């Protein structure tokens, strides 16, 4: 009775979530996430999932759009790149989900765990659960950043 995140509809994900934690290896620094925008998880006919979020990388607003294509392995998703394998997990807390992904950059393996869910306004229990995922993934000692919730991408000079 374990599973992962793909019973009949990931228990309804749809909606604009947020990012509360993002582990970033200490190999590729330069690019540093300064702020993040609400994550929009669109459920495609329950078959595929689309996640659109804008990140503030080094003052630069990077619009991200990942498509979680369902595979023959429930709880596993991939992108056209076939080199990006995303795994969606249901945090131990409500309104919280652990997002993980694996692949490679310029010929080097790269991954990352992201904690999404802020409905109840920050959850320490979820952070621990996530911090467990990172641990379980050995990413509990990376750069771990909690990008403030920025409903919109913009430095913030006002």
From Swiss-Prot:
The keyword Transmembrane helix does not apply. CDD domains: lipocalin_1_3_4_13-like. GO terms for molecular function: chloride ion binding; cysteine-type endopeptidase inhibitor activity; signaling receptor binding; zinc ion binding. Disulfide bonds join 61-153. Mainly expressed in lachrymal and salivary glands. Also expressed in the prostate. InterPro entries: Calycin, Lipocalin, Lipocln_cytosolic_FA-bd_dom, von_Ebner_gland. Keywords: Disulfide bond, Secreted, Sensory transduction, Signal, Taste, Transport. GO terms for cellular component: extracellular region; extracellular space. GO terms for biological process: proteolysis; sensory perception of taste. The keyword Chloroplast does not apply. It is found in: Secreted. It comes from the Eukaryota. Its main location: secreted. Predominantly monomer. May form homodimer. Interacts with LMBR1L; this interaction mediates the endocytosis of LCN1. Belongs to the calycin superfamily. Lipocalin family. PANTHER family: LIPOCALIN (PTHR11430), LIPOCALIN-1 (PTHR11430:SF136). This is Lipocalin-1.
């Amino acid at each position: 009775h374990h599973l992962l995140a793909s019973d009949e509809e990931i228990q309804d994900v749809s909606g604009t979530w947020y990012l509360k934690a993002m582990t970033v290896d200490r190999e590729f620094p330069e690019m540093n996430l300064e702020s993040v925008t609400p994550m929009t998880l669109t459920t495609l006919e329950g078959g595929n999932l689309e996640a659109k979020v804008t990140m503030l990388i080094s003052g630069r607003c990077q619009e991200v759009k990942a498509v979680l294509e369902k595979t023959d392995e429930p709880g596993k998703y991939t992108a056209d790149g076939g080199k990006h394998v995303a795994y969606i997990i249901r945090s131990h807390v409500k309104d919280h989900y652990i997002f993980y992904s694996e692949g490679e950059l310029h010929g080097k393996p790269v991954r990352g765990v992201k904690l999404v869910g802020r409905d109840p306004k920050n959850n320490l229990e979820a952070l621990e659960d996530f911090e467990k995922a990172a641990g379980a993934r050995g990413l509990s000692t990376e750069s771990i950043l909690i990008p403030r919730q920025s409903e919109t991408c913009s430095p913030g000079s006002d």
